[PDB]
Amino acid sequence: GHLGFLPRKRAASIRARVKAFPKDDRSKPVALTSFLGYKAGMTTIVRDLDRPGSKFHKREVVEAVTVVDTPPVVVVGVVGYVETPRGLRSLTTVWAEHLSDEVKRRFYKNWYKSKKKAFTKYSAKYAQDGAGIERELARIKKYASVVRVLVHTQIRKTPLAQKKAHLAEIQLNGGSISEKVDWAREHFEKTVAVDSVFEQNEMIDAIAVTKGHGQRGYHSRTSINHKIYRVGKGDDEANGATSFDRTKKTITPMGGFVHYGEIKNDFIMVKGCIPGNRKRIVTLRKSLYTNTSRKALEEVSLKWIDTASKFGKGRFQTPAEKHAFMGTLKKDL
Amino acid sequence: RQSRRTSTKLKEGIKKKASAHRKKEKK
Amino acid sequence: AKSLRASSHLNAKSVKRRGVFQKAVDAREQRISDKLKEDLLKQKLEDLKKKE
Amino acid sequence: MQLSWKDIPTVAPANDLLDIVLNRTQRKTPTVIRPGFKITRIRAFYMRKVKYTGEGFVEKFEDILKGFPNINDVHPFHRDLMDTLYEKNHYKISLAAISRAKSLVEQVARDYVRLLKFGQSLFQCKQLKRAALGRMATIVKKLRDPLAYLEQVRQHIGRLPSIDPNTRTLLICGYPNVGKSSFLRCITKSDVDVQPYAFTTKSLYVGHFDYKYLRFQAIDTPGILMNNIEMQSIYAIAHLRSCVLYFMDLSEQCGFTIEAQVKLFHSIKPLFANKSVMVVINERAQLLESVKEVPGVEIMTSSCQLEENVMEVRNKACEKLLASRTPFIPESVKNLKKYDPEDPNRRKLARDIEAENGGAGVFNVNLKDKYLLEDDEWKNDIMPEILDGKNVYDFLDPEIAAKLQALEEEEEKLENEGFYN
Amino acid sequence: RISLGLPVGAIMNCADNSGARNLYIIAVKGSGSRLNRLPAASLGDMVMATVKKGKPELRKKVMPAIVVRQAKSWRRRDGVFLYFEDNAGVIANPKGEMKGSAITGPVGKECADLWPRVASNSGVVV
Amino acid sequence: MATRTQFENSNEIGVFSKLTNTYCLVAVGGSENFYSAFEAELGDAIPIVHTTIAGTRIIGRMTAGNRRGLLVPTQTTDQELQHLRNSLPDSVKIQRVEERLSALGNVICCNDYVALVHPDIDRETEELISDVLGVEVFRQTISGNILVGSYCSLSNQGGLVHPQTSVQDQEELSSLLQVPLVAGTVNRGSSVVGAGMVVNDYLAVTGLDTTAPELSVIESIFRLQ
Amino acid sequence: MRIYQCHFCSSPCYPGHGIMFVRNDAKEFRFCRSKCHKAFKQRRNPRKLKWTKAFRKAAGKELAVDSTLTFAQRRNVPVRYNRELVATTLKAMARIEEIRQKRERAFYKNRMRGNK
RNA sequence: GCGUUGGAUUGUUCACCCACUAAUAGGGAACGUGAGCUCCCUACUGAUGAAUGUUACCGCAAUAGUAAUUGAACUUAGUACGAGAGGAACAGUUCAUUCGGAUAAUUGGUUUUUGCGGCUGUCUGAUCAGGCAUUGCCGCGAAGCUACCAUCCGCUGGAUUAUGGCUGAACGCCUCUAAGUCAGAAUCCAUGCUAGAACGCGGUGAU
RNA sequence: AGCGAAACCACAGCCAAGGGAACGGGCUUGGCAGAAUCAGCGGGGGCUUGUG
Ligand SMILES: [Zn+2]
C-alpha cells in the first residue's frame, strides 16, 4: 500500500479539519474561504460536453455527481492569530452574545441534565456600550496576521436528528485586518448564504472522514479539484428543472434520498464522489490557488437531472409520472 | 561513506603486516 | 514524460493564472456584499417590527 | 539490402572499442568477491564475466559485418562504384579480418571457461579471468589498422547518394566546366557549384524531376580526360540503364578545345554505343559532324539564358526513354473566385478565425451563427427537448394546433354524452 | 474508456469474407503489465491472432486483428450499456486496410470512429 | 479545381465528409483546417454543415444525398436532426429512415439523377429514395463486392470504381448511369475509392497521398477542366 | 436525448438506466431493467406475462387505439423551429396528458362495471 | 526520483529463441521468505488508558511519513530540414496505461428482507393454513458483503548537480572561479497530503 | 459466572557501532526512554573490480 497515508488510524472526530487555507489577495475585499455541509447520496447527470479539442466535443455525456446538503451558516465569533517563531498562536477569540441552542449544545456532552448556563456571564460582559468586548476586538485589530471566523451548522433546518451544531474555523482572505474584523463585527449572528461562497462551474476541494468498516477505514481524506455543477436554493421551487428540461421537480428523488431526507434548503452538486458517506459532515475549501486548465475554464450546460428513486429501481421521475403511466388503481377509486 | 575507527583486528593486523615487512627487507 | 514537479507544466500553468477565474470570483464577491448584506437589512426590518 | 546506406552503427577506433566493452564487463556485472566464499561461487563469478565480455566484442562485430554491404553481392554498378572510391581488396580483407577476429573472441571464451571450472584456489581463478580478457584485448589491439579505415568508409558510404538503376535515369556528362552545373541548377532543385576551375564536383550529383506524370532522375558526372575520379565517370554510363547527355561548347569558354571533345567521343565509344546518345551544344563547323559518324547522334544549337530551349532538351530526352439529360452546376460557385493564400484582402476562413482567438485545440467550434433560420434573433437556441416522460420531438410538428382543435371538438362531443359520472 | 471481455486465449469468430472462421488470441497490442494477471482486450483493439479453422492461405500465419464484437456489457457516454451476441473479430494488415471486402454482423460504434476503413468496409453499423 | 487536404492526418476524406451540389457535411473536432479547405474552395455560396451523426465523427460513409434531399440513419439523434434543418434551405429535404442497416454511405451511391443501392434492402427504402431525391433507383453490385458506395464515387460528369472491375461490368453499368466509367485507384493504390475521395460536378477532394498519375485519371473522367 | 419505450415493458427507459442488446440481425433491443432482460434470455413471450403493457394493449385492460395516443407517433420530418410553434407545445402536451388520463379513467369505469 | 514481461525445455536445467512494451539494468540483505516450496522474549499494525484546577469547545505544529507514472492523438506540418526518399520539435490541447486515494449512480459472484410466485418429500376428515425439509429446488429481488468487473480525483515555489555563461584575477595576454555573479536535472528542500508529542503549547465557555 | 492444571524457571530482555578469537545478553561510545493494558501477523530467536 501507499506509505504517505500513515499512520492509517482513526480520525480525531466525525468532523475532519481543514489542514491548509487559501493564501491571500490583498486587493480583494473580505471573503470567506470555505463552507460546510452534509453528504446526501449520489445522482446521475447528463450534459453536452462543450470541451474543445475533444473526442466527446458537443456530444451528450453521462456522469455520477454527489449532492451535499449545505444550509446557510451562522457566525458566532471571530479569532486573531499572531505569527510566532513557533508558528501561530491564537491570542484572542471573541464571540457574539446571542448564541443558539444548537451552538451551546456543542459545549455540553450531556445537554439534558445541564442547567444550560453557558455563555451567560460572558453575555453580561457584552451588556454595555462595549468596553471589554470592543477592547478584545482592538486587540486583534492591532496584532495578528490571519483572522478566522467561528461558525456553526444550522442543524434544525437539516433532516438529521443529531441536533448538535458543528463548530468549524474558517479564515478570511480579504485584504487588510482592519477590514477583516469590521466585516466580522457586522456579520455576528447573521446567517451566511452558500451561493455567496461558491458559484457554478468552479473547482473546489472537499474534506470528509471516510466510510468506516470494521483497523481499516475512518480516516480524514481531502480530495482536490472537483467541479461544482449546481448551486441550488431552497426557496426556489424546481431545482431539478434545467434550462432544457424545465419540468417542475426537485433534485430529491421520490421519497427522499437514500437514508437521507428531503432537501428543503440550499445544496451543492459536485462532480464525482466526495469521500465518506451520507450524513457525514463535509467542509468545502476553495482550492488554494488558481488552476487555469481547460478542465477548469469550461462553463457547463446541464441538460437533465435524474430524480428517479434509487431505493430499489426508478422507472419514473415525479409522482405525476406514476399515474400518467399506470392510469388509476384500486385504492384511488 | 567510509569510517575512521580502526577495528582492533586491523589495528593489530597492521603490526602483523609491518612485522612481515621487517623480515622481508633482511632477506 | 514530465512530472507534476517538472519545469514544463510549472511555467505553462503560471502564464494563464490571470484569466477569467480571477474575475469570476470578483463577480461573485459582489453577491457576498449583496444578499448577505441584505440579511443584515432584513433582520433590521424585524428589529423595526420590534421597535414599533 | 536497399540502395540507401545511412543506418550504419558507428565504429569506435580500437582503443575506444576496448573501453566500451572492457568497461561494460565492470559496470553491468558483479565486481566484488570474498576470499572465504565457496569455490563454485568464485568459479561462476568469473565465468559470468569472461562469457559476458566474450559475447560483448562478438555483439559489437555482429553490428559491423551485418551493417555494411558485402561489395560483390550487391549490384554490377555498385560493386564498381565502391571500387572506384575505395580499394575493393582492402575492403574485402576488412570483411575477413573482422570475420577471423569474431571467431577468435569466441575461441577465447570457449577455451578459458573450460579451463576456469578446474581452477581450485582464488589466485588461479582470478588470474585466468585476467588471462581471458588479456587474450581478447590483444585481438582488438591488432585491429587498430582496419577499424580506422572502416571509420572513413562509415562516413563516405553514409553520405553517398541512393540511385536506382531501374528508374528512368539520364547521365549529364562532358568536359570540366562546360556548363553542366548551370544545366542541372535550373532544370531541377539540386545545389551544384558553378565555379571557374577544373574538378568542381568530385562526385555524382542526382537531380530528381517529373515529366508526363512519370518519375525521372538526372545524374551529373565529374569529368573525363587512369585516375579514380576519372574511372567513376566512365563506369557511370557503362553500368546504368541511361541515356548519355554529352555537352559541348561553341565558344572561347570552358578552356578546353572543341577538337578535344571529338577525340573524347571516339575513344570512349566502346561502352555508350548501346545506350542511345543525346548531344547538345551550348574546319570549325565541319568537325562537329565527324561526331555524327557514330550510329546514335543528335546535334542542337542552344541558348541557356532563356528557359524554353533548355527545357526542350528535357522534352526530347523523355520521349527517348519511353520507347526503349443535363448535369447541374449552381451559378454562385462559378461567379466566386478561386482561393488565393497570399492575398491581403479576402474572406476569412476558420483557420484564420480560430487563430485570432488563439490556438487550435482551445477554441470550441461554435455551431451557432452558421445556420439559416427565418428570423436571426433566436440564433441562441434553447429547445425544451423533454416534457415529463415524453420527449418534445414525438409531438413536435407544424400545424399541430389545428390537430389539437380536432381533439378539442372531440371533447365537447364526449362530455355531453356522460362518460364522467 | 471501454470495458474488457476478450482475454489472452479467447476464441473470437470471423466477421469478414476472407476465408477464416475463428481467431485464437495470443497477445494484446498496447497492454499494461499487470501482476499475477494476463492483460485483456476490448472493442477496436488490435490483437495478435492465429487462425484455427479456415484456408491454407490464411493458416500457419501470425497476424494482427481488430475486434468488432465484444460480448461483455460495456459503457457508452450516451447513458445506456450494451453488448453483442458473440465475441468476434476481423483481420487486417498493420495500416488498417481490410482484407475482407464486406463485413457480416454488427460493428461497434467505439471501433468505427477509431478506424476509418473499418467505417467504410462495414455492412451494418451498430 | 481538384484539392488535396486532410482530416486528423487520415487519407480517408469521404468517411469524414459528404459533398453534394447544394451542400457539404463536416464533422466537428479539434481541427478546423478540414473545414477551412472546403471554406476556401466553396465559399459562402453553398452551405457547409458542421454536424455529428448519432454522436460520431464518421459522417460521409453513414449518410446519402444530392441536390433535392438528404438521407440519415435510424441511429440519428433528435438534436443532430434539429440542427440539420436549422441550416439547409427548402430546396433540400431531410428524412430519417427506419432500418436494419445504418451504413447509408456504404449502400447508396447517388447523384442528382441515378441511385445505386444494395440488393438486400427493404422495399420501403426504394419507394422513399425515388420520392424525396427525385432519382431512379437500382439494385446492383460492382465486381462481386456488395457495398457499392464504398467502392464507387459518383457524380453527374463521371464515376470511379475500384481497379478490380471487369470490362463487362464497366460498359454495361455505364449504360445505367448514361456516363462512362473508369476503374482506377485513389490514395496511393487503395481499393476503397468512394470513401477515399469526395466529388460533385465542379469539385474533387482527395487525400494527401493521392499521386499525380491518380489525379490525372480523376481530372479526365470527372471533367474538371 | 430520446425516451425509449422498452421492448419487454414498453415503459420509459432513461439514459443510464437499463441494458440494450444488439442481435446479429441488428436492431435495438432496449430494456428498462435487468429483470425484463433476464426474462428475454429465457425466450418468454411479452404478451403472455401480465405486468407489462404488451398484454394490456392486446387483451382489453387499457385502451390501445385513441385520438390522444396517435399524437405520440415516432416523428420523422425535421422542422425549422419557431419561438412560438414550440411555445404552444408546452401547453399542448399539458392539455393532452389531462385527456389521456380522463379517457383512461372513462375506460376504467367501463371495465369496473359488472360488480354492481 | 519512478519503472523493469510472457511461452516450448527438468536422464543429473548447469543451453536458447519470436511475442509485446518506453525499457523489459545488474546486485546485496548467507543456511534471505527449506519449521510459504519441487502457553521462552520482543519488533511491528492498531486500540484504550491514570496523571499534570476540573470539564468542554475551537486550534497551533515540534516531529515522522509522503506520490504519482508512462505513452499516443489533434494543431504547430507535410513547415523547418533534404537531390528525393523521408520527416521534427517548443508553445496550445485530448485521452489512455500502471500505481494510489476515494466512491455505489449503473454493472456484477452476491442474500439467512431466509422478500414474493411455482413445484415436491410429508400430511392435518378435504378445500384453506404451509406445520416441517442439517439453509428443499427454480424464477427474480431491494438492503447489505463487495470488485478494473465499474465512476471521480491525483500540486507549485525555492535551492542545486552535470552543463552553458557574465565580470575577472592569479600570471602587464587569456581563462565560467580564486573573491564575485546569471540560468539550469524526473534531484534536493519547501508548498500541498497523513498523524499529532499520550510528560509540546494557546485561546475561549461554566461556579 | 463457577471449578482449575502442567511443562518450564540463574537473572533480565530497545536499537547503532566497537568490543581481536566462526562469543555477544550484561561492558565502551551514542540514539534514546514516562505509569497501566487489550487485539493482530504467523515476523525474527581494510579482502575485491579492466586490459594474459
Ligand atoms: Zn421492462
JSON list of N, CA, C and O in Angstrom, two decimals, chain G residues 14-33:
[
{"chain": "G", "resi": 14, "resn": "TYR", "atom": "N", "xyz": [-34.79, 5.62, -19.33]},
{"chain": "G", "resi": 14, "resn": "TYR", "atom": "CA", "xyz": [-33.98, 6.83, -19.17]},
{"chain": "G", "resi": 14, "resn": "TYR", "atom": "C", "xyz": [-32.47, 6.57, -19.38]},
{"chain": "G", "resi": 14, "resn": "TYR", "atom": "O", "xyz": [-32.02, 5.44, -19.17]},
{"chain": "G", "resi": 15, "resn": "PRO", "atom": "N", "xyz": [-31.70, 7.60, -19.82]},
{"chain": "G", "resi": 15, "resn": "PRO", "atom": "CA", "xyz": [-30.26, 7.42, -20.05]},
{"chain": "G", "resi": 15, "resn": "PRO", "atom": "C", "xyz": [-29.49, 7.11, -18.76]},
{"chain": "G", "resi": 15, "resn": "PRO", "atom": "O", "xyz": [-29.60, 7.84, -17.77]},
{"chain": "G", "resi": 16, "resn": "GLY", "atom": "N", "xyz": [-28.72, 6.02, -18.80]},
{"chain": "G", "resi": 16, "resn": "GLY", "atom": "CA", "xyz": [-28.01, 5.49, -17.63]},
{"chain": "G", "resi": 16, "resn": "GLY", "atom": "C", "xyz": [-28.71, 4.29, -17.01]},
{"chain": "G", "resi": 16, "resn": "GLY", "atom": "O", "xyz": [-28.11, 3.54, -16.24]},
{"chain": "G", "resi": 17, "resn": "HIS", "atom": "N", "xyz": [-29.99, 4.13, -17.35]},
{"chain": "G", "resi": 17, "resn": "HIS", "atom": "CA", "xyz": [-30.80, 3.01, -16.88]},
{"chain": "G", "resi": 17, "resn": "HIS", "atom": "C", "xyz": [-30.96, 1.95, -17.96]},
{"chain": "G", "resi": 17, "resn": "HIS", "atom": "O", "xyz": [-31.04, 2.27, -19.16]},
{"chain": "G", "resi": 18, "resn": "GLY", "atom": "N", "xyz": [-31.00, 0.70, -17.52]},
{"chain": "G", "resi": 18, "resn": "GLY", "atom": "CA", "xyz": [-31.27, -0.44, -18.40]},
{"chain": "G", "resi": 18, "resn": "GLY", "atom": "C", "xyz": [-30.10, -0.89, -19.24]},
{"chain": "G", "resi": 18, "resn": "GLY", "atom": "O", "xyz": [-29.05, -0.24, -19.28]},
{"chain": "G", "resi": 19, "resn": "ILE", "atom": "N", "xyz": [-30.28, -2.03, -19.90]},
{"chain": "G", "resi": 19, "resn": "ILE", "atom": "CA", "xyz": [-29.26, -2.64, -20.75]},
{"chain": "G", "resi": 19, "resn": "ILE", "atom": "C", "xyz": [-29.84, -2.90, -22.15]},
{"chain": "G", "resi": 19, "resn": "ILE", "atom": "O", "xyz": [-30.87, -3.57, -22.29]},
{"chain": "G", "resi": 20, "resn": "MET", "atom": "N", "xyz": [-29.18, -2.34, -23.16]},
{"chain": "G", "resi": 20, "resn": "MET", "atom": "CA", "xyz": [-29.53, -2.55, -24.57]},
{"chain": "G", "resi": 20, "resn": "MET", "atom": "C", "xyz": [-28.82, -3.80, -25.11]},
{"chain": "G", "resi": 20, "resn": "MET", "atom": "O", "xyz": [-27.71, -4.12, -24.70]},
{"chain": "G", "resi": 21, "resn": "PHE", "atom": "N", "xyz": [-29.49, -4.50, -26.02]},
{"chain": "G", "resi": 21, "resn": "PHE", "atom": "CA", "xyz": [-28.92, -5.67, -26.67]},
{"chain": "G", "resi": 21, "resn": "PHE", "atom": "C", "xyz": [-28.94, -5.51, -28.18]},
{"chain": "G", "resi": 21, "resn": "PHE", "atom": "O", "xyz": [-29.89, -4.96, -28.75]},
{"chain": "G", "resi": 22, "resn": "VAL", "atom": "N", "xyz": [-27.88, -5.98, -28.82]},
{"chain": "G", "resi": 22, "resn": "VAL", "atom": "CA", "xyz": [-27.76, -5.92, -30.27]},
{"chain": "G", "resi": 22, "resn": "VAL", "atom": "C", "xyz": [-27.57, -7.33, -30.84]},
{"chain": "G", "resi": 22, "resn": "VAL", "atom": "O", "xyz": [-26.57, -8.01, -30.56]},
{"chain": "G", "resi": 23, "resn": "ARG", "atom": "N", "xyz": [-28.56, -7.76, -31.62]},
{"chain": "G", "resi": 23, "resn": "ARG", "atom": "CA", "xyz": [-28.58, -9.08, -32.26]},
{"chain": "G", "resi": 23, "resn": "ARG", "atom": "C", "xyz": [-27.67, -9.09, -33.50]},
{"chain": "G", "resi": 23, "resn": "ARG", "atom": "O", "xyz": [-27.26, -8.03, -33.97]},
{"chain": "G", "resi": 24, "resn": "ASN", "atom": "N", "xyz": [-27.35, -10.29, -33.99]},
{"chain": "G", "resi": 24, "resn": "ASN", "atom": "CA", "xyz": [-26.64, -10.45, -35.26]},
{"chain": "G", "resi": 24, "resn": "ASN", "atom": "C", "xyz": [-27.51, -10.07, -36.47]},
{"chain": "G", "resi": 24, "resn": "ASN", "atom": "O", "xyz": [-26.99, -9.88, -37.58]},
{"chain": "G", "resi": 25, "resn": "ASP", "atom": "N", "xyz": [-28.82, -9.96, -36.25]},
{"chain": "G", "resi": 25, "resn": "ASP", "atom": "CA", "xyz": [-29.76, -9.41, -37.22]},
{"chain": "G", "resi": 25, "resn": "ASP", "atom": "C", "xyz": [-29.80, -7.87, -37.14]},
{"chain": "G", "resi": 25, "resn": "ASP", "atom": "O", "xyz": [-30.29, -7.21, -38.06]},
{"chain": "G", "resi": 26, "resn": "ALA", "atom": "N", "xyz": [-29.28, -7.34, -36.03]},
{"chain": "G", "resi": 26, "resn": "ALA", "atom": "CA", "xyz": [-29.01, -5.90, -35.81]},
{"chain": "G", "resi": 26, "resn": "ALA", "atom": "C", "xyz": [-30.21, -4.94, -35.85]},
{"chain": "G", "resi": 26, "resn": "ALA", "atom": "O", "xyz": [-30.53, -4.34, -36.88]},
{"chain": "G", "resi": 27, "resn": "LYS", "atom": "N", "xyz": [-30.86, -4.85, -34.70]},
{"chain": "G", "resi": 27, "resn": "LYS", "atom": "CA", "xyz": [-31.80, -3.77, -34.36]},
{"chain": "G", "resi": 27, "resn": "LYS", "atom": "C", "xyz": [-31.78, -3.60, -32.84]},
{"chain": "G", "resi": 27, "resn": "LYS", "atom": "O", "xyz": [-31.22, -4.44, -32.12]},
{"chain": "G", "resi": 28, "resn": "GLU", "atom": "N", "xyz": [-32.37, -2.51, -32.36]},
{"chain": "G", "resi": 28, "resn": "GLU", "atom": "CA", "xyz": [-32.31, -2.15, -30.93]},
{"chain": "G", "resi": 28, "resn": "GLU", "atom": "C", "xyz": [-33.23, -3.02, -30.07]},
{"chain": "G", "resi": 28, "resn": "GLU", "atom": "O", "xyz": [-34.45, -3.07, -30.29]},
{"chain": "G", "resi": 29, "resn": "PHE", "atom": "N", "xyz": [-32.64, -3.70, -29.09]},
{"chain": "G", "resi": 29, "resn": "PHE", "atom": "CA", "xyz": [-33.38, -4.38, -28.03]},
{"chain": "G", "resi": 29, "resn": "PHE", "atom": "C", "xyz": [-33.15, -3.64, -26.72]},
{"chain": "G", "resi": 29, "resn": "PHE", "atom": "O", "xyz": [-32.20, -3.92, -25.99]},
{"chain": "G", "resi": 30, "resn": "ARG", "atom": "N", "xyz": [-34.03, -2.68, -26.44]},
{"chain": "G", "resi": 30, "resn": "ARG", "atom": "CA", "xyz": [-33.88, -1.79, -25.29]},
{"chain": "G", "resi": 30, "resn": "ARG", "atom": "C", "xyz": [-34.74, -2.21, -24.10]},
{"chain": "G", "resi": 30, "resn": "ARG", "atom": "O", "xyz": [-35.95, -2.42, -24.23]},
{"chain": "G", "resi": 31, "resn": "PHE", "atom": "N", "xyz": [-34.08, -2.33, -22.95]},
{"chain": "G", "resi": 31, "resn": "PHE", "atom": "CA", "xyz": [-34.72, -2.77, -21.71]},
{"chain": "G", "resi": 31, "resn": "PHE", "atom": "C", "xyz": [-34.67, -1.69, -20.63]},
{"chain": "G", "resi": 31, "resn": "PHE", "atom": "O", "xyz": [-33.75, -0.87, -20.61]},
{"chain": "G", "resi": 32, "resn": "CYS", "atom": "N", "xyz": [-35.68, -1.69, -19.76]},
{"chain": "G", "resi": 32, "resn": "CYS", "atom": "CA", "xyz": [-35.77, -0.73, -18.65]},
{"chain": "G", "resi": 32, "resn": "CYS", "atom": "C", "xyz": [-35.03, -1.19, -17.40]},
{"chain": "G", "resi": 32, "resn": "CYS", "atom": "O", "xyz": [-34.56, -0.36, -16.61]},
{"chain": "G", "resi": 33, "resn": "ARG", "atom": "N", "xyz": [-34.94, -2.51, -17.21]},
{"chain": "G", "resi": 33, "resn": "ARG", "atom": "CA", "xyz": [-34.19, -3.12, -16.10]},
{"chain": "G", "resi": 33, "resn": "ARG", "atom": "C", "xyz": [-33.70, -4.53, -16.46]},
{"chain": "G", "resi": 33, "resn": "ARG", "atom": "O", "xyz": [-34.06, -5.07, -17.51]}
]
